[PDB]
Amino acid sequence: TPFPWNKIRLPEYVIPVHYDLLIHAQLTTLTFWGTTKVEITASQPTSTIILHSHHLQISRATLRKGSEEPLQVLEHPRQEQIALLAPEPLLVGLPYTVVIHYAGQLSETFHGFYKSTYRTKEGELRILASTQFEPTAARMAFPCFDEPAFKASFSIKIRREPRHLAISNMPLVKSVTVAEGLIEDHFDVTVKMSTYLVAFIISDFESVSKITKSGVKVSVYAVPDKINQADYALDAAVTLLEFYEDYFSIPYPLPKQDLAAIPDFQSGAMENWGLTTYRESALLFDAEKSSASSKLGITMTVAHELAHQWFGNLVTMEWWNDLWLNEGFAKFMEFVSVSVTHPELKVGDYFFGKCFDAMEVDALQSSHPVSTPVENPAQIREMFDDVSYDKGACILNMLREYLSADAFKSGIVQYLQKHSYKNTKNEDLWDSMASIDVKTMMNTWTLQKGFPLITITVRGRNVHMKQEHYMKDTGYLWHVPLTFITSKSDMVHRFLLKTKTDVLILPEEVEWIKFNVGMNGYYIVHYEDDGWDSLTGLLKGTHTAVSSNDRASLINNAFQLVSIGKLSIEKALDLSLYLKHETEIMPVFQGLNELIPMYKLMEKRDMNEVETQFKAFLIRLLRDLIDKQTWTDEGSVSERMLRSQLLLLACVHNYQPCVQRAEGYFRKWKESNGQLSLPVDVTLAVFAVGAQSTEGWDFLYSKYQFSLSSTEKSQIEFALCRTQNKEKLQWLLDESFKGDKIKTQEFPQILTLIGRNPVGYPLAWQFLRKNWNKLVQKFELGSSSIAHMVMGTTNQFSTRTRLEEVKGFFSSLKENGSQLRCVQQTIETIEENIGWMDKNFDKIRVWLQSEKLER
Numbered sequence: 099t100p101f102p103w104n105k106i107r108l109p110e111y112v113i114p115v116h117y118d119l120l121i122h123a124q125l126t127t128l129t130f131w132g133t134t135k136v137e138i139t140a141s142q143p144t145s146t147i148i149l150h151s152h153h154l155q156i157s158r159a160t161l162r163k164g165s166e167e168p169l170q171v172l173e174h175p176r177q178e179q180i181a182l183l184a185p186e187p188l189l190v191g192l193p194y195t196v197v198i199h200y201a202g203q204l205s206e207t208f209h210g211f212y213k214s215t216y217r218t219k220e221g222e223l224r225i226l227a228s229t230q231f232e233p234t235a236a237r238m239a240f241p242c243f244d245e246p247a248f249k250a251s252f253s254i255k256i257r258r259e260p261r262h263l264a265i266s267n268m269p270l271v272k273s274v275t276v277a278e279g280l281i282e283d284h285f286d287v288t289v290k291m292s293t294y295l296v297a298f299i300i301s302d303f304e305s306v307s308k309i310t311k312s313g314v315k316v317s318v319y320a321v322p323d324k325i326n327q328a329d330y331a332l333d334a335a336v337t338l339l340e341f342y343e344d345y346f347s348i349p350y351p352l353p354k355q356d357l358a359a360i361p362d363f364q365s366g367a368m369e370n371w372g373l374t375t376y377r378e379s380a381l382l383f384d385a386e387k388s389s390a391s392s393k394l395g396i397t398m399t400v401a402h403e404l405a406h407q408w409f410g411n412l413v414t415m416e417w418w419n420d421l422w423l424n425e426g427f428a429k430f431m432e433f434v435s436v437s438v439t440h441p442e443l444k445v446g447d448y449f450f451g452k453c454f455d456a457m458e459v460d461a462l463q464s465s466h467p468v469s470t471p472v473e474n475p476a477q478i479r480e481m482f483d484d485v486s487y488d489k490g491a492c493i494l495n496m497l498r499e500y501l502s503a504d505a506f507k508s509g510i511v512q513y514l515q516k517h518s519y520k521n522t523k524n525e526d527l528w529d530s531m532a533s534i535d536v537k538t539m540m541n542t543w544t545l546q547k548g549f550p551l552i553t554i555t556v557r558g559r560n561v562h563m564k565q566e567h568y569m570k571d572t573g574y575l576w577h578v579p580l581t582f583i584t585s586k587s588d589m590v591h592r593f594l595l596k597t598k599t600d601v602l603i604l605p606e607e608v609e610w611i612k613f614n615v616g617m618n619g620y621y622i623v624h625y626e627d628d629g630w631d632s633l634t635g636l637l638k639g640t641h642t643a644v645s646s647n648d649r650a651s652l653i654n655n656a657f658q659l660v661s662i663g664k665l666s667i668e669k670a671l672d673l674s675l676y677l678k679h680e681t682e683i684m685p686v687f688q689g690l691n692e693l694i695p696m697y698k699l700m701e702k703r704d705m706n707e708v709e710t711q712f713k714a715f716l717i718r719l720l721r722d723l724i725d726k727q728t729w730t731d732e733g734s735v736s737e738r739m740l741r742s743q744l745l746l747l748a749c750v751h752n753y754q755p756c757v758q759r760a761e762g763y764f765r766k767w768k769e770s771n772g773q774l775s776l777p778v779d780v781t782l783a784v785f786a787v788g789a790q791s792t793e794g795w796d797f798l799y800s801k802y803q804f805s806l807s808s809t810e811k812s813q814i815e816f817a818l819c820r821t822q823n824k825e826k827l828q829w830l831l832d833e834s835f836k837g838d839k840i841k842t843q844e845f846p847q848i849l850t851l852i853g854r855n856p857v858g859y860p861l862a863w864q865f866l867r868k869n870w871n872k873l874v875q876k877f878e879l880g881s882s883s884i885a886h887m888v889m890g891t892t893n894q895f896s897t898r899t900r901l902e903e904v905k906g907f908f909s910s911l912k913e914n915g916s917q918l919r920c921v922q923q924t925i926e927t928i929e930e931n932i933g934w935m936d937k938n939f940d941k942i943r944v945w946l947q948s949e950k951l952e953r
């Protein structure tokens with residue numbers, strides 16, 4: 099019989115109410131079986147039930163009316179569906195139960211119901227089984243109506259050996275002994291939720307717990323050897339859940355919240371309702387070895403996953419085209435919450451960096467609107483990108499500054515209350531925010547890609563403003579909430595620009611004007627006539643006349659304008675010279691973010707002399723700030739992050755005072771047999787210098803197997819990827835790909851670091867090409883992991899030959915990668931790199947030879 103349904107989306111006329119899932123995993127044979135019972139009703143007469151199933155071996159399917167009838171099973175593996183045919187049509191509105199018996203193999207990927215492993219201190223391999231369903235992998239563990247708008251309650255039962263613990267979304271009601279060495283755990287019924295949020299883990303994890311003031315038991319789960327690193331996340335999770343409950347005025351509805359650190363995990367974390375899961379590096383904190391960056395990362399990742407309990411779980415997007423309703427909000431709420439719960443982290447100052455990263459992809463033709471259509475699993479996975487997360491958060495921040503925090507908060511509380519246990523579209527959010535023209539304005543920011551360039555022309559008191567789509571002509575127009583300050587006023591002045599152009603009149607003439615105050619708006623600014631000269635003069639003479647975020651926005655925008663010929667490279671580089679006086683993390687890092695990519699392009703070309711001169715200029719520019727750093731872990735989180743990055747930068751570029759100190763610390767660390775406690779903040783620099791020799795690299799690698807510290811593992815991995823030894827770089831690719839000595843969850847990062855190694859970069863792009871099929875099988879087409887490997891190995895090329903290697907390779911893949919959005923993005927980036935280098939290389943050579951810092 100041919101397949102009776104020819105659409106990717108399921109029919110809307112058969113709706114589930116409740117699922118009873120029985121799962122029995124065998125961790126010795128790596129197999130599982132299940133029985134899924136789903137209560138359904140049909141809104142129209144049908145004899146066919148279409149549902150999702152992927153890589154499950156279905157043995158039997160029956161239909162119970164409320165008698166039992168057998169169902170004929172048909173499969174459509176490409177659509178990832180099964181069709182269950184009943185002997186007679188279902189009666190409308192009457193309850194039926196579909197019962198499906200099946201078996202599967204535990205996935206060897208990081209999705210579905212997959213295998214995870216770890217080693218004990220004695221070298222014994224331990225196996226656990228965990229889940230990762232978002233977006234479409236629930237259908238790999240149980241047959242279901244696997245679309246987020248088909249919400250249902252779930253009663254989960256897990257069969258296991260007595261040596262294992264099982265945890266799931268809800269608390270454990272009871273454990274029944276079925277037979278010898280066979281226990282069945284019954285978990286309480288969940289509230290109405292999407293299939294992608296179902297979770298279960300079978301392991302020998304240990305836990306620590308703490309109860310919130312609202313009575314919620316919060317626990318952190320981890321392997322026995324790492325449960326002593328769970329205290330920080332446990333305390334942070336309790337404080338953040340209490341923050342969100344008080345903030346939203348909507349209690350967390352479940353009796354418990356678990357945070358599990360999984361030894362193998364693809365993304366950073368996942369918000370499964372009641373059972374949030376994390377990479378061990380995103381949750382576990384070692385008070386002696388963890389970095390300030392990693393502590394910030396745990397805090398923000400926990401805040402993100404807990405925000406999703408409201409934004410994503412309680413209220414879910416109707417379809418993946420509106421995935422930003424979940425991810426943009428969760429990303430933005432990390433800042434809203436942590437700014438209050440952990441004020442010592444000063445996160446609010448760092449938000450804007452995400453917006454500049456989103457602008458890098460959003461300035462290309464291959465970007466997409468925040469809300470855009472998706473059909474198949476690879477396209478849906480492509481929605482987990484910088485546009486949904488970072489542009490999503492940045493436009494919400496822009497809107498909050500525009501409406502005020504009070505009006506914005508009222509709109510989001512109304513929205514969550516109105517749509518609790520249901521699904522929403524982009525329009526529902528805008529109607530909630532307008533109930534406090536929001537919809538017209540925010541449609542310009544979510545229903546078309548990109549962002550505007552705002553051009554300012556000052557004629558005495560007359561300030562002319564123009565908008566145009568910034569693209570590296572569509573005729574796009576936005577409702578832009580402009581802000582500005584002047585040399586006469588530091589009040590934030592506002593002007594809503596809804597037309598191509600407008601003009602305003604200043605009360606008095608000014609010496610300078612600066613738009614996008616604190617860079618809270620998702621747009622860039624160009625100043626005509628002497629505007630850039632006036633702003634450059636202000637930064638050179640009195641840089642604290644504007645805030646550190648305003649200084650960072652001027653640096654970023656000046657370099658973005660060079661790409662479209664609005665500002666010469668010489669004038670942008672002249673502006674950057676003020677950084678010799680800068681002390682603040684955001685503008686110092688913004689200077690690095692703009693300048694470092696220039697020598698990354700030179701490293702992949704025969705441009706050694708200008709590359710070396712450019713690197714010497716960068717070190718000279720920040721020399722006073724580098725020399726002021728102590729080689730300790732002293733200071734605030736920003737002082738520590740600034741120290742670590744500056745010392746690492748100085749050492750990799752052979753700045754002699756720092757290389758000598760790093761060389762001495764590494765030699766002493768190796769002499770001590772790795773017992774010397776180095777300051778965590780200098781460890782990246784010390785290890786990167788030490789790995790340059792064969793003996794140093796082998797010694798660093800010998801310590802890797804014993805480490806229980808996520809930071810130490812990450813620091814060693816970074817250092818090992820910096821060697822000039824090509825056999826060692828190849829070995830890291832081969833071993834992390836294999837997953838024994840270095841876990842495969844680190845492969846995408848290792849591949850990108852080697853792709854950025856000045857001598858070993860050809861090896862990363864070659865490895866990706868030669869192992870494409872296995873990498874796609876492990877990480878999936880459309881995944882953020884694949885996108886980071888594609889862009890990480892190719893987006894710093896700047897020759898027509900490299901451009902054609904990329905086009906030729908990906909077009910030869912046909913259905914296994916030729917249509918990837920990351921491929922078009924990297925092709926467009928290489929085209930821009932070719933043009934930028936051709937135009938600016940010798941201009942930079944001449945500018946460097948002028949030695950303006952030495953003048």
Ligand SMILES: O=C(CN1C(=O)CSc2ccccc21)NC1(C(=O)O)CCCCC1
Binds near residue numbers: 692695746750855
């Ligand atoms: O360049 C990189 C990585 N990287 C890029 O590949 C270009 S975008 C970028 C912007 C800011 C910071 C790092 C960036 N890392 C270092 C390098 O020269 O390879 C320099 C910094 C010390 C670590 C090594």
Ligand SMILES: [Br-]
């Ligand atoms: Br049974």
Ligand SMILES: [Br-]
Binds near residue numbers: 580592
């Ligand atoms: Br505003």
Ligand SMILES: [Br-]
Binds near residue numbers: 557558560
């Ligand atoms: Br005038």
Ligand SMILES: [Br-]
Binds near residue numbers: 728729730
């Ligand atoms: Br010191």
Ligand SMILES: [Br-]
Binds near residue numbers: 868
């Ligand atoms: Br090849």
Ligand SMILES: [Zn+2]
Binds near residue numbers: 402406424425428
């Ligand atoms: Zn998220």
